[PDB]
Amino acid sequence: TTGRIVAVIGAVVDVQFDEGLPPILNALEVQGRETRLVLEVAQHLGESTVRTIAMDGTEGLVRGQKVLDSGAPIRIPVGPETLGRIMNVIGEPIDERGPIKTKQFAAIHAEAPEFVEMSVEQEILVTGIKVVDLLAPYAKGGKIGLFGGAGVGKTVLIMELINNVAKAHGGYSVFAGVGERTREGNDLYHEMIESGVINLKDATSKVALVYGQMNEPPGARARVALTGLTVAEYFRDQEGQDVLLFIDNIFRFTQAGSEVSALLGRIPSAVGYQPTLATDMGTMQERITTTKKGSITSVQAIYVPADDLTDPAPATTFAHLDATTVLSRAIAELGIYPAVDPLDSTSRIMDPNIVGSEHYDVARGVQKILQDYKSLQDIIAILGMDELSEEDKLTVSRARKIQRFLSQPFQVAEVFTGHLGKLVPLKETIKGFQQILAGEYDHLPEQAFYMVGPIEEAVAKADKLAE
Amino acid sequence: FAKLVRPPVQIYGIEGRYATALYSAASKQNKLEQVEKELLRVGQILKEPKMAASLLNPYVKRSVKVKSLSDMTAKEKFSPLTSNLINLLAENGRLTNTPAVISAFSTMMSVHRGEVPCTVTTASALDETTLTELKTVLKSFLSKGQKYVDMSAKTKIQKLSRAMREI
Amino acid sequence: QKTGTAEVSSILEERILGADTSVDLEETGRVLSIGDGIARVHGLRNVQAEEMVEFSSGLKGMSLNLEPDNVGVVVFGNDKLIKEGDIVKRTGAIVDVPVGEELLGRVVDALGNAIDGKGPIGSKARRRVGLKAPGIIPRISVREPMQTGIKAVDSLVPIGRGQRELIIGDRQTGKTSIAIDTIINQKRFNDGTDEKKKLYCIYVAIGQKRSTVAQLVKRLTDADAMKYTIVVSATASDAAPLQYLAPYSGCSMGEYFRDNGKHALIIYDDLSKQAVAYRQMSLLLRRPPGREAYPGDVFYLHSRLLERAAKMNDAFGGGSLTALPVIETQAGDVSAYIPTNVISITDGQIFLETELFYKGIRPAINVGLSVSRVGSAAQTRAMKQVAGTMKLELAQYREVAAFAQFGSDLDAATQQLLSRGVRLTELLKQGQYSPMAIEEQVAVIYAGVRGYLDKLEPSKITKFENAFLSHVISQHQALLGKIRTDGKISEESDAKLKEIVTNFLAGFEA
Amino acid sequence: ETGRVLSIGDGIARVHGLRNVQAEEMVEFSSGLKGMSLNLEPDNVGVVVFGNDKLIKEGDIVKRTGAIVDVPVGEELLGRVVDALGNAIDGKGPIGSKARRRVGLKAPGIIPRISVREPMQTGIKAVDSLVPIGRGQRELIIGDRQTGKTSIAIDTIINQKRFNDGTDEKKKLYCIYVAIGQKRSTVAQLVKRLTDADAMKYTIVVSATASDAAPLQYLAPYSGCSMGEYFRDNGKHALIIYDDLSKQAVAYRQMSLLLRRPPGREAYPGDVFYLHSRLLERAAKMNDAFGGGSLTALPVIETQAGDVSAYIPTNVISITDGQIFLETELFYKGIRPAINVGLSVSRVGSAAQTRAMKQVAGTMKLELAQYREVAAFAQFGSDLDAATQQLLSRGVRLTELLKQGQYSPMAIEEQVAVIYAGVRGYLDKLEPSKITKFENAFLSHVISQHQALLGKIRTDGKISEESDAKLKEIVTNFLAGFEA
Ligand SMILES: Nc1ncnc2c1ncn2[C@@H]1O[C@H](COP(=O)(O)OP(=O)(O)NP(=O)(O)O)[C@@H](O)[C@H]1O
Ligand SMILES: Nc1ncnc2c1ncn2[C@@H]1O[C@H](COP(=O)(O)OP(=O)(O)NP(=O)(O)O)[C@@H](O)[C@H]1O
Numbered sequence A: 001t002t003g004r005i006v007a008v009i010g011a012v013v014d015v016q017f018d019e020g021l022p023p024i025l026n027a028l029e030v031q032g033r034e035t036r037l038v039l040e041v042a043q044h045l046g047e048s049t050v051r052t053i054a055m056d057g058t059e060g061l062v063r064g065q066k067v068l069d070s071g072a073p074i075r076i077p078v079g080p081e082t083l084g085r086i087m088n089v090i091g092e093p094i095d096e097r098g099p100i101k102t103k104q105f106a107a108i109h110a111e112a113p114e115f116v117e118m119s120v121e122q123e124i125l126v127t128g129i130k131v132v133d134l135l136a137p138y139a140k141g142g143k144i145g146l147f148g149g150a151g152v153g154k155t156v157l158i159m160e161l162i163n164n165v166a167k168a169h170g171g172y173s174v175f176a177g178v179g180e181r182t183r184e185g186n187d188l189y190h191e192m193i194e195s196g197v198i199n200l201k202d203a204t205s206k207v208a209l210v211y212g213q214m215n216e217p218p219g220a221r222a223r224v225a226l227t228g229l230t231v232a233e234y235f236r237d238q239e240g241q242d243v244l245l246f247i248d249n250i251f252r253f254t255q256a257g258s259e260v261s262a263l264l265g266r267i268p269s270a271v272g273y274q275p276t277l278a279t280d281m282g283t284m285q286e287r288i289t290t291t292k293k294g295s296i297t298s299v300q301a302i303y304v305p306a307d308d309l310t311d312p313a314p315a316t317t318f319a320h321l322d323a324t325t326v327l328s329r330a331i332a333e334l335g336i337y338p339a340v341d342p343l344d345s346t347s348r349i350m351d352p353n354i355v356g357s358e359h360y361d362v363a364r365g366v367q368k369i370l371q372d373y374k375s376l377q378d379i380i381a382i383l384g385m386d387e388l389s390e391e392d393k394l395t396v397s398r399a400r401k402i403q404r405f406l407s408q409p410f411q412v413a414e415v416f417t418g419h420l421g422k423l424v425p426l427k428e429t430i431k432g433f434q435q436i437l438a439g440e441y442d443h444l445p446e447q448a449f450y451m452v453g454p455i456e457e458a459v460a461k462a463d464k465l466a467e
Numbered sequence B: 001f002a003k004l005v006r007p008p009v010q011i012y013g014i015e016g017r018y019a020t021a022l023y024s025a026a027s028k029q030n031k032l033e034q035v036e037k038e039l040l041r042v043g044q045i046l047k048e049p050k051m052a053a054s055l056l057n058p059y060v061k062r063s064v065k066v067k068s069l070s071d072m073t074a075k076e077k078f079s080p081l082t083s084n085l086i087n088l089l090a091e092n093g094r095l096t097n098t099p100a101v102i103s104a105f106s107t108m109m110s111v112h113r114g115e116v117p118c119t120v121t122t123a124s125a126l127d128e129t130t131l132t133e134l135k136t137v138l139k140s141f142l143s144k145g146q147k148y149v150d151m152s153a154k155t156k157i158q159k160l161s162r163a164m165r166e167i
Numbered sequence C: 001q002k003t004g005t006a007e008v009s010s011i012l013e014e015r016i017l018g019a020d021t022s023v024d025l026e027e028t029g030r031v032l033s034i035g036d037g038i039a040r041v042h043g044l045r046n047v048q049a050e051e052m053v054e055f056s057s058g059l060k061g062m063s064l065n066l067e068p069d070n071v072g073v074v075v076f077g078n079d080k081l082i083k084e085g086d087i088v089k090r091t092g093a094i095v096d097v098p099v100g101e102e103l104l105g106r107v108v109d110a111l112g113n114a115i116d117g118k119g120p121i122g123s124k125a126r127r128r129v130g131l132k133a134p135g136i137i138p139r140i141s142v143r144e145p146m147q148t149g150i151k152a153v154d155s156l157v158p159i160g161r162g163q164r165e166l167i168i169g170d171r172q173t174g175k176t177s178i179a180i181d182t183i184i185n186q187k188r189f190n191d192g193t194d195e196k197k198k199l200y201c202i203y204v205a206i207g208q209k210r211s212t213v214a215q216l217v218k219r220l221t222d223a224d225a226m227k228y229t230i231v232v233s234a235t236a237s238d239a240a241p242l243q244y245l246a247p248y249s250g251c252s253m254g255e256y257f258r259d260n261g262k263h264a265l266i267i268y269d270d271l272s273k274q275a276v277a278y279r280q281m282s283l284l285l286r287r288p289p290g291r292e293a294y295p296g297d298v299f300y301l302h303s304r305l306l307e308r309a310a311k312m313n314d315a316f317g318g319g320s321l322t323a324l325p326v327i328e329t330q331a332g333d334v335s336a337y338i339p340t341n342v343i344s345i346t347d348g349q350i351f352l353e354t355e356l357f358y359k360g361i362r363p364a365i366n367v368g369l370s371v372s373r374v375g376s377a378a379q380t381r382a383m384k385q386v387a388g389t390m391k392l393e394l395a396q397y398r399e400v401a402a403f404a405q406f407g408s409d410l411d412a413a414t415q416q417l418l419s420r421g422v423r424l425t426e427l428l429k430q431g432q433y434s435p436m437a438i439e440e441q442v443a444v445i446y447a448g449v450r451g452y453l454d455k456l457e458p459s460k461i462t463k464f465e466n467a468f469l470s471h472v473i474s475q476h477q478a479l480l481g482k483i484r485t486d487g488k489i490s491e492e493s494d495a496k497l498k499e500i501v502t503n504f505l506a507g508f509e510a
Numbered sequence D: 001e002t003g004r005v006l007s008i009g010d011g012i013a014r015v016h017g018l019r020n021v022q023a024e025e026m027v028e029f030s031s032g033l034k035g036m037s038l039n040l041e042p043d044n045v046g047v048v049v050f051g052n053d054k055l056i057k058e059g060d061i062v063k064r065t066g067a068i069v070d071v072p073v074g075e076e077l078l079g080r081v082v083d084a085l086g087n088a089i090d091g092k093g094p095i096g097s098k099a100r101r102r103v104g105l106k107a108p109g110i111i112p113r114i115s116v117r118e119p120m121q122t123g124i125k126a127v128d129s130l131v132p133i134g135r136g137q138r139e140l141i142i143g144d145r146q147t148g149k150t151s152i153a154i155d156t157i158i159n160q161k162r163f164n165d166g167t168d169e170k171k172k173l174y175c176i177y178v179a180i181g182q183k184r185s186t187v188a189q190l191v192k193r194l195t196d197a198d199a200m201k202y203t204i205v206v207s208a209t210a211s212d213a214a215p216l217q218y219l220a221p222y223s224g225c226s227m228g229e230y231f232r233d234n235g236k237h238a239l240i241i242y243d244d245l246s247k248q249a250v251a252y253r254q255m256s257l258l259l260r261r262p263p264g265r266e267a268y269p270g271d272v273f274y275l276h277s278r279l280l281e282r283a284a285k286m287n288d289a290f291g292g293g294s295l296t297a298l299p300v301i302e303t304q305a306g307d308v309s310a311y312i313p314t315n316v317i318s319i320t321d322g323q324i325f326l327e328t329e330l331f332y333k334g335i336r337p338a339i340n341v342g343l344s345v346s347r348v349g350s351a352a353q354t355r356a357m358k359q360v361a362g363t364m365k366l367e368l369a370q371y372r373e374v375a376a377f378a379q380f381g382s383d384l385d386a387a388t389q390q391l392l393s394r395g396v397r398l399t400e401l402l403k404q405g406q407y408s409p410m411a412i413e414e415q416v417a418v419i420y421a422g423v424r425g426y427l428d429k430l431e432p433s434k435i436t437k438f439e440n441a442f443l444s445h446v447i448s449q450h451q452a453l454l455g456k457i458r459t460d461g462k463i464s465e466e467s468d469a470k471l472k473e474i475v476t477n478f479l480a481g482f483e484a
C-alpha cells in the first residue's frame, strides 16, 4: 500500500505502513523525487515499520514523505535488448538512449541453482596469457577469480582478458563494474565501440553493461552485482548459450554491505565485517554458476584489503572459485607484469588426466624450480652468490629466465609497457618453458626473456641486445 | 496482527508506547472521552500521602500491587476497559511511569479536537478549528478588547528580539 | 534502549481490550520482528530450548534464545517468506535425521533430505542430531588401524579407529584430498570378506560451493566409493542453522554404525566454516562477542561434536566412529581461536604446507609438525617395524638438512644421513587418488629404510617404486598377501624381500 | 517555520520539532548560527553545529532554511581565502558571489566524460616523467609527515604561472587549495609563499583549520570541490588539492561518533570510504559535448611510520588513479624530492604527456624498477655478465637528474632537455658527484643560446628528427668541453 518515512540516517531509511507491510527484499517507491529512489526492504522492526537500504542518496527526504509498496523485489530489463546498453542498479538506462525496450523482467533476488543442476564438465579455456595457461589454466564455463592488492594489475588483466577471450567469442558477454572507477567505465565503453563489441548503429552488440561505481551509495554498490548477474543469468538459462560474465570488483559488494551493516543493527565481527559476510557471499556466488541449462564463464576481480589475502573478504571468496589467479605486489614491483604469483595461483583442471602429462609435468617443473630459487634467496643475497653449488647457480640461472619469460607485453598495456601487445598459443608456451627448463638457453642472457611473446621472440631479443 | 488506529499526533517512538495504544483501543467503542477524564483522576489517586509507599517501591512487587489495583479500579469511577492500562503498567513494572502515559494521552486527544499554537506573552489560543491561522486573528481581537555592519545585527536585535518585552 | 520487545501497541493494545486466540500463545506465537535470519516471536510460551517450530509460510526454525518476553528464533531458509505477524507454531518437533544403511550412495542435505534427485530415502530409523557422546566406561583404548592408504600418514601419523585426527593447513594444500583418498582406500576392505575391517564413510561438506560438492561426488563415484559413503552437504548458499547443524547430522548417521557393532569414518570438511555460521547466528541473536567475535561456546560447540567419535568396548558392539575434522588456517596461524580449539580437542594433527607442496612433497605433509597421540598403537606390526626406523631416520635427516647446500664436503658420516633422508623422502611422495595397501606400503618403505635404495639417483626412485611395487603385486602376490594376513614381517618374509628388492634393482638400473 | 532544542553538547544539538525538515538540510540557530540536519529520527533531529556550541542552550530556537548546503563559486573567488562556507577571511571584504553552487553534488556518470588525454604539468622532473598526471586524473600524494607532501602541490600551482600569464586558453589551469586540519600559522605562511612567487592570483584557497568546528572540516573539501566543479562544467581547467584527507576523515569520525553512529575500524564510521570515494569521483575530464573542461585532483594522505595498511591510506589508494609515495629515508639520503619511483604509479601513463617527454621517458619507468632490482641483487663486489654491467653504470647518473630544487618548477621543454642528456647516453661517462653543477649549466646555456629548439618542442610538443638533430650536437658540444 502507501507508507510514510519515519526516520532517516545516511543510507538506511525506516518506513511505516498503515496496512501493507512489504516482505523483506520488496522494492519500495519514494514518492516525490526529481529522480527515482528505491528502497530495498531489509527487515521488520515491527509495529508496521520496515528498515531499508536506499539505491540512491537520501539527501532531501523528509519525515513523513510518501512511500509506495512496489509489491515485489527490484525488477530489471533482462533480455536481449540490453546489449550495447549501459544499465544500472535498478534498470534505468544511462548512456542516454531512452527506455530499454523489452517485455520480460526478472527480480534480481533469485534463489540458487540446486544440487542436481550442477554441471561437472570442465575443459581448458586457453587465454593466450602464458602464465595463466601454463600454470593455472581457466576452464570453459567456470568460476575464475582475479586476486589483487591495489595497483598490481588486477583491472588491466581483466581488460586484456575481455580483449582476448571475449572477442574471439561468438556468444554473449556481460561486464559489470561494481564499486570501482567511473573513469574506467567511460574508458571501456569507448574501447568497446572502437572494437565494436558494442555497435551504436546495427544490433550486433555482444555485451551488456551494468554499472554502479565508487561514487554511488552503499545501497547501490551492495546490489549492482545482484543486477549485472540477473542480466547474465537470463542469457544462460534461455539460450543455453556461452555467457561471459565479467565483474570488477566483486569486493565492493561485501564492502558496500559493510558500510550499512552498522546502521542495520549488527554487532560487528572479526576485522569488523558484517556478521554475515559469509552467507551474503554464498547466496550470491552460488548464483554465478553453470547449470545443465547453460554455461557462464565468470571472471571476477577481488580487491585484497591491504594485500592481506587473509582478510575475511578475499579469504572467503576463494572457496567459490575453480581457478584463481593471484597477483603479487612484490612481483609487479620487479616490473614483471602481469604480476601473477606462479606459486599462489591455482586451477582445478591442472590434472595430468585433463591437461596431459606433458603440460602438467612441465607446469609443476617450473613451479618447482621457482620455488627452489625462492629458497636460495636469503643465502645468496647476504652470504656471497658464488658460494652456491654448481647445481644451484644453474637452478638460479634458469629460474630467473623462466621467471621473466613469464611476463607478457599485454595488448591493453602498450600504453605502459612500450612493446607491441602479444599472445601465445598454449602449445608454444608449454614448449617454450619445457625448453628453458631443459637447459637449452643457458647461454642467452636474462633480459631476452623479459617481455617477449612466443619463445623464439626471445632468441630475437637475444641478438638485438647482443650486437 | 490487529490493525491500529494511529491518530495523526503519533507522539513518541520509544517509551510512552502504551499511550499510542489506547487511541486505538478506545477508538473501538468510541470511549475516547470516557477515559480522557478517567486518567485525569487516577493521576492523583497515586499522588496521595497513602499511595507513594508502592508508587516507587520495588518492595511489594507484582504481587500485592496488581490485586491491590483491583481496588483503585473496581471501586472508583472506573472499572471499564481502562482499568487495564493500569493492570498492564502493574505487571509490566511501569507504574512508576503512568503520569507520562496520561500526559501523552492528552496531547494526542487534543489534536483530534483543539490545536495547540500559543501566543507570545501568555496563554493558549486553543484554535479548535478545521483551519490553522484562520481563527488566529479573529480570536486575538478578544485581546485588544480584554546601515553600518553591526547596526545591521543590532536592529533585528530589538524588533522580534531578546530579553525586553519578553518578561 | 530501555523498553522491551512484545511491549508495544500491536501487542499492547490487546492486553487492554481482551484478546482470546485460544492457544494462549502456549502452542503458538506471532512474529514480533524479522531480519537477517532472526525471527523474534511473541508467545510460544511453552516451547523448549532448541525446539523446532514451523512458520506460517511453511519454513522451519529453531528456538535458541528463550528470552523472558519473547522467543528468539533462527530461520532455516530465506526469510522474504516471513513477515511481522505470521503465526509460529510448536510442532512437538524433535530435530532428528535419517539413519542406517539406506543412505550409502545418497547425497542428503543438512537435515537428511535427498538432494541427489534420486527420490525417497528408505530410512528405517531416525536418530536425534543432538546426543551426548559415550562416556568414560563404554570405551576401550583405540587399537584397530584406520588405514588411509597414504604412505606419509600410515607410517608417520597413524590413525586408529575411534581417533580424531585433524587435517589442518593453509588453503589449497590438499587437506580435502587427504580425506578423499582415505574414503577411496576404504573400499578394498568393503569389497573383502572381513567384516571386522570394513569402514563406512560419511563426508560432511560445510560451506562449499555446489560445483564443488558435485565434482567431489563424481570423483567418489568414479572410484566406486559412493557405494559405501554418505555425503551430507550444507552448501554456501544454505542458511546458517543448516550449516551449523550439518556436522551433527553427519555424526549421528555414523553414530548409528558405531552403535551397531560397525565402523564409520566421518569427515567434517570444513569445521572452520561451520564455526563462522554459528558465529553469525550468535551475533545476530545479540550474544556477547569474544575473540574474533566468536561466542563463548564455540569451543563447547566443537567439543560436543568431536568427543562423539569413540571406540566402544566389546560389551557395546565393539563399534567405532572415527573423525577427520578439517580446519583452514590463515597464513599458517594455528594459534588463532578456532585452530587452537580444535587442535586442543583432537588427538592429532596432520599439517600441510605450501612450500612443501611446490618443492615436490605431495602429499605435502610436514612430518615434523604432524602427530598422532594414538601412534604406534594404531599400526599393524609390519608397518611398525619399518615405520619406526624411517621416522628416526627422517628425524636425523631433518637435524642436518642445513648442510644440504653449504655441505658438498662434510663428514662422510652425515653425508650419509642426507642421502638416506632424501631417499626416504622420495618414498613418502604419492600420487593423487592412488591409496596403497598396507602390505604394499611396508614393502616399498622396507626397500629404502634398509639401505637398498641408497645407490640409486633420487629422481628414479618414484619410478623404481612404481615398477617394483607392480612386480611383486603380480608375481609375489605370494608372500605379500602373506605379509598382510600374518600382520608381521616374518624372519622368512624378510629374506624373500631382500631377494626381490636387491635383485630387481640390480636389473632395473642395468 | 521550525522548532526547539532538546539538548546540546559537543557540537551535537538534538531538536524536538523541525517536523518538515529535509535530511541534510541546513537549519539556523537562535544565535544566528548555521547548523545541519543529519539524523532524522522519529522524535528529534540531531544537528551538527557549524561552530562554537556555547551560544546554544537547551530550549533555543532552530529555524529551517529549506536549502541543502551551498557555497560561493566562480572567478569572483580567485586570489581570495575563504573559510569552509565561502566567507572571506583574508580581510578584504566579501567576494562578488553571483554564482552559488551546492556542495552535495554527485559526480559525473559515464557518458559526460572522455579518456584523460590532457597533460597537467607539475614542473617536477620526477613526476612529469615517471608518474605524469593529466587533466581529470586523481593522483594521490601519500607519505609520512615532513617528507615533502605539500612542497609537491605548491610547486605545482606555482608552475601554472607560465600558462595563466599567456594566450593559449587550453593550457590555463585555475587552482583551488583546500586546507583541512592544519594550523592558521601555516595556511597563512603558505598563502604568503604563493603570493610571493605570484600565483595567488589564479588560486582559490578554502581553509578549515584546527580551531574550526568539526563539521566545518568535514565539509571543507567538498565546498572547495563545488568551486572547482564550476570551472569544469563551464569549459575551463581546475586543479584542486585537498590537504589533507587524513585530517578530514578524522573530523568526519568525530561528527559520526558524537552522533552515536556505532564505530568501526580504528573508530571511523562505516561510510568512511564512501566519504573519500564520492568526493574524489567528482574530479573528471568532461567530454567535448559538455565543455571539454576538467578537474584534476591531488588528494593528500599522511601515513604513520609508513603503514599503508592503515584503514584510510589503503582506501584512498584504492580510489585515486595512482599515487606518489614519499619516504623520509630517501629524503635524507639525498633524493629530494623523495619519491620512490618503483612504488609510485600513474594509471594514465604516457596518455598524459607530450610526445616530447614520452620519447625520453616512456619505458624508463619499467627500467628504474629493474635497474632498481638489478643493483639490489648484485650489490656485492663480484662479477656479472655483459648485459647487466651497464644498467648500473647508467642509473646512478640518471637519478642525480630527478634530484630537484624546491619552489622552482621547470617548463616541459627544459625537462626534455636534461632528460635527453642522459637517456640517450650523453652522460653515460660522468662521475655522479658532478651531474648537478652540470645540469645547472647546460640548461642556462641552452636557454641563452637556443630559445630556438625550446620554441619548437614547447609548441608542437614533440621532437622531430629536426629538433633531435640540433640537440645531437648542442649536447656533444659540451662533454668534450669540460672533461675531454
Ligand atoms: N598427492 C597429490 N599430488 C599432486 N597434486 C595433488 C595431490 N593432492 C592434491 N593435489 C592437488 O591439489 C589441489 C587442491 O588440493 P585440496 O584437496 O583441494 O586441498 P584444500 O586444503 O581443500 N584446498 P581448499 O579445499 O580449496 O581450501 C588439487 O587440484 C589437486 O589435484
Ligand atoms: N625538493 C626539495 N628539496 C629540498 N628541501 C625540500 C624539498 N621539498 C620540500 N623540502 C623541505 O622539506 C620540508 C617538508 O615539506 P612539506 O611539503 O611540508 O612535506 P609535508 O609531509 O607535507 N609536511 P606536513 O604538512 O607537516 O605533513 C620543508 O619545510 C621544505 O623546505
Ligand SMILES: Nc1ncnc2c1ncn2[C@@H]1O[C@H](COP(=O)(O)OP(=O)(O)O)[C@@H](O)[C@H]1O
Pocket (backbone or CB within 6 Å): A148, A149, A150, A151, A152, A153, A154, A155, A156, A157, A337, A338, A410, A413, A416, A417, D345, D346, D347, D348
Ligand atoms: N599488463 C601490464 N603491463 C605492464 N604494467 C601493468 C600491467 N597491468 C597493470 N600494470 C601497472 O599496474 C597499474 C595498475 O593497474 P590496475 O589493474 O588498475 O590495478 P587494480 O588491480 O587495483 O585494478 C597500471 O596503471 C600499470 O602501470
Ligand SMILES: [Mg+2]
Pocket (backbone or CB within 6 Å): A154, A155, A156, A180
Ligand atoms: Mg581497478
Ligand SMILES: [Mg+2]
Pocket (backbone or CB within 6 Å): C175, C176, C177, C269
Ligand atoms: Mg578442502
Ligand SMILES: [Mg+2]
Pocket (backbone or CB within 6 Å): D149, D150, D151, D243
Ligand atoms: Mg603538507
